Enzyme design. Structure first.
Site, PDB file in Angstrom:
ATOM      1  N   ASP A 116      -5.335   0.958  -4.230  1.00 42.49           N
ATOM      2  CA  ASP A 116      -6.278   1.573  -3.335  1.00 42.49           C
ATOM      3  C   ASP A 116      -7.483   2.081  -4.046  1.00 42.49           C
ATOM      4  OD1 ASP A 116      -7.093   2.161  -0.890  1.00 42.49           O
ATOM      5  OD2 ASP A 116      -5.707   3.773  -0.523  1.00 42.49           O
ATOM      6  N   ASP A 140       9.030  -1.418   1.655  1.00 40.73           N
ATOM      7  CA  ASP A 140       8.640  -2.763   1.971  1.00 40.73           C
ATOM      8  C   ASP A 140       9.138  -3.326   3.274  1.00 40.73           C
ATOM      9  OD1 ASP A 140       7.373  -5.253   0.917  1.00 40.73           O
ATOM     10  OD2 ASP A 140       9.387  -5.996   1.121  1.00 40.73           O
TER      11      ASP A 140
END
EC number: 2.3.1.48
Lengths: 405, 232, 221
Positions: A91, A290
């Site tokens: 990010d 995930d």
């Protein structure tokens, strides 16, 4: 040759510009297998070792970039060994003053991780479950109650005037309290990336920063697609698996996106399909936070694990709520061997390894618990990370200057 | 219908009974724990660094303060929590006063004792839980923090000054001025921090202290304080 | 004075160890105190609950995680539950954990197939070998009359557990709520899954807070 994390990063940073960086790593831990084992299977891994690598980059007293990666090494009693690199998050917060390639930064950090010899993670490994049998005197362990602990401290003082055991980290004890393993330095390497767009991943409320650039799912996939392609060309041998899946999208488009990649072997699909064509549970890796694991868990909670198959699995997954199309989500996989042999062993210069998970989480939290609605948050993260390290670890963030022209 | 209404009411009255019971129970616990706390704290004094170690072992406490503050947090040698509901029924069982004593740092921080009080207040509703509030208490900021000290900041509404202000406001020293009556202008989540001390840190300091004594450092926090099960 | 000093530490560490034990005692007293007061209120409360039809059914449907624990086929039967009663063993003797409790269900009979009956299951905490261990809920299997449809998979009914079908059908039965009734907590992975978590679901949430759940259901309604 680039032989240090610094060597790698500088090469990709603007020349003459100063950047600092954090490179946090967890103590390798013995853990359950990445993919659930099949009892009716020829073989089973003797051990699986998990390590997390966390990176943050700071420029001018502000943090603007972060990358979270996990590295599993799997040992088979007779069937070789593979290592799997899971890329979890990356990010930016848009608070960087200068101009940089986040893409090449991300790519270069991944090459560094590729460079690391697998054995490095196997030298001393924290046991999933420790046994204190080989040891008396009585030890104060995770299991001990406070009262027992207090009492033990008192006895120790009375016996020796100290609460500590000198021999605790002594080599015979280490042999008893830790695990070690070896393996061919040249091993099968896998990288799995799942891309799902979101406004923020590691920098909460950075979405509120106008300076920040947010990618839609397609943009994001392309972004990770490009990095992977280079990794393949730069660090991988020629006949290497490269698979891309975009759920709910027609395969001509996907196949057509792929055609455009520099590496010529990209294919539509996943790196989990097997010759045996087993069930989904037996081929799908369960990663932290995930999309594939959340859904394998549901199939478990419904006694469906036996029911689903790989082909069915992908279809069933796309159906679920986190998957609201049209949004573009992709799963990427790489399987193969490195061009150059992995020989690197990281140094303190290369990484900071906290003494515990607790200490590891505390530091990371300074970055990920912050608010980046405004620049003050970016600065604060830098401030805490620095002050905390010096204070509790007598450590400094690495410092370097960009070389690229 | 009417019988049902009767039952429903009776149900609503039962839930109201439970609340009273809970309060009673809490008071009962506070009265019993009191004399054990006195005994316990007296032992704690003999131990040096007890508080420094505890405040390093508590996980969320760090969330509320700046890392630099730990230089000063480490000078705390005593913490005392008195629950007000024991002196009078006027007070909520959540109300307490906390006293900290800091030993100080040469040339930087002054040795001092500070006492802060937290009480629940309500604003216009019968059916609202209430929030913690407090009064500012004087504390002598460390010299290192001259630049971010609200009392030494000259240009306060100044753009740079306003940023130096907000930085000081996110230190443990800012929290002492927290009141809960001016939202958005005070130490963030000062009420939550207050709750940690009364709810967790003071009550369980010893568990926290024992957590720091594990022989293998990697086991700290393992105590507490993702695979399947395929076939049946 | 190196001796004297490391000796005051050892004294205080023992003092603290004693206080930690005093506090564990107090917690039990407090929890008992609470249990004693809650009994009359609960009784009053249950007596109001009968007057409400399907209170339990609605509540069970409303609880979030409770449904995860059991088979969908199961709900038809669950909806026939018209009474739940939890009793806290520790009220009757200092030999039970405050956590220990007995729970009774009454099932409205279903015709033709499902009998109406009242069943009581008991759970208590047990520890094994090591003093420094938390303890866990355990239970004794208790008789329950299975519905006929589940007959094909009733464990007593299955001819051979081992056959692949048996392996699959039998497993199926254990996963049912009825399967739960024979849950003990001593044959890990040979029994109903997370049978202890369900138990605790009942004594910590579904029962003490059934009303709130019922209400939330009405609002949702």
């Amino acid at each position: 040759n680039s032989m240090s994390l610094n060597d790698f990063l500088s090469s990709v940073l603007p020349v003459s510009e100063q950047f600092e960086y954090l490179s946090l790593q967890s103590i390798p831990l013995e853990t359950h297998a990445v993919v659930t084992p099949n009892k009716d299977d020829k073989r089973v891994p003797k051990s699986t070792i998990k390590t997390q690598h966390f990176f943050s980059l700071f420029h001018q007293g502000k943090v603007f970039f972060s990358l979270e990666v996990y590295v599993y090494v799997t040992l088979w009693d007779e069937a070789d060994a593979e290592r799997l690199i899971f890329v979890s998050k990356a990010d930016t917060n848009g608070y960087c003053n200068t101009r940089v390639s986040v893409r090449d930064i991300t790519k270069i950090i991944l090459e560094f991780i590729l460079s690391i010899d697998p054995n490095y993670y196997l030298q001393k490994v924290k046991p999933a479950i420790r046994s204190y049998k080989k040891i008396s005197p009585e030890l104060i362990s995770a299991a001990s109650t406070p009262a027992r602990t207090l009492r033990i401290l008192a006895r120790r003082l009375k016996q020796s005037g100290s609460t500590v055991l000198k021999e605790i980290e002594s080599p015979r004890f280490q042999q008893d309290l830790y695990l070690s393993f070896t393996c061919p330095r040249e091993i099968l390497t896998k990288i799995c990336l799942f891309t799902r767009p979101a406004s923020q991943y590691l920098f909460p409320d950075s979405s509120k920063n106008s300076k920040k650039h947010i990618l839609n799912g397609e943009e994001l996939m392309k972004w990770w697609g490009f990095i992977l392609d280079r990794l393949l060309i730069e660090c991988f041998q020629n006949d290497t698996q490269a698979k891309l899946r975009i759920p709910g999208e027609d395969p001509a488009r996907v196949r057509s996106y792929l055609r455009g990649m520099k590496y010529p072997l990209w294919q539509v699909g996943d790196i989990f399909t097997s010759k045996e064509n087993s069930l989904a549970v037996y081929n799908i890796p369960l990663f932290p936070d995930d999309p594939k694991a959340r859904f394998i868990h549901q199939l478990a909670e419904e006694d469906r694990l036996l029911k689903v198959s790989l082909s069915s699995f992908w279809i069933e997954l796309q159906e679920r709520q986190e998957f609201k199309l049209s949004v573009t989500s992709s799963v990427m996989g790489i399987s193969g061997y490195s061009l150059a042999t992995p020989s690197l062993f990281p140094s303190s210069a290369d990484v900071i390894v906290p003494k515990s998970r607790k200490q590891f989480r505390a530091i990371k939290k300074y970055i990920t618990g912050e608010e980046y609605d405004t620049e003050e948050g970016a600065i604060e993260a830098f401030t805490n990370i620095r002050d905390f390290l010096l204070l509790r670890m007598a450590t400094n963030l690495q410092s370097l200057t960009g070389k690229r022209e | 219908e009417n019988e049902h209404a009767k039952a429903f009411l009776g149900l609503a009255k039962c839930e109201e009974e439970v609340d009273a019971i809970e309060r009673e129970v809490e008071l009962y616990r506070l009265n019993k724990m009191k004399p054990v706390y006195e005994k316990r704290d007296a032992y704690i004094d003999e131990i040096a660094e007890f508080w420094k170690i505890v405040l390093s072992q508590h996980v969320s406490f760090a969330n509320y303060i700046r890392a630099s503050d730990f230089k000063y947090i480490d000078t705390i040698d005593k913490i005392k929590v008195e629950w007000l509901a024991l002196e009078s029924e006027m007070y909520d069982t959540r109300d307490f006063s906390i006293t900290f004593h800091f030993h100080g740092i040469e040339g930087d921080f002054k040795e001092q004792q500070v006492t802060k009080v937290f009480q629940i207040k309500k604003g216009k509703d019968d059916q609202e839980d209430g929030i913690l509030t407090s009064e500012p208490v004087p504390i002598e900021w460390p010299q290192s923090y001259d630049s971010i000290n609200p009392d030494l900041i000259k240009d306060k509404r100044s753009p740079e000054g306003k940023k130096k202000y907000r930085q000081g406001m996110k230190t443990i020293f800012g929290w002492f001025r927290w009141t809960g009556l001016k939202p958005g202008k005070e130490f963030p989540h000062g009420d939550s921090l207050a709750s940690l001390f009364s709810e967790e840190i003071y009550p369980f300091c010893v568990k926290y202290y024992a957590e720091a004594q594990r022989d293998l450092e990697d086991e700290e926090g393992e105590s507490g304080l993702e695979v399947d099960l395929p076939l049946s």
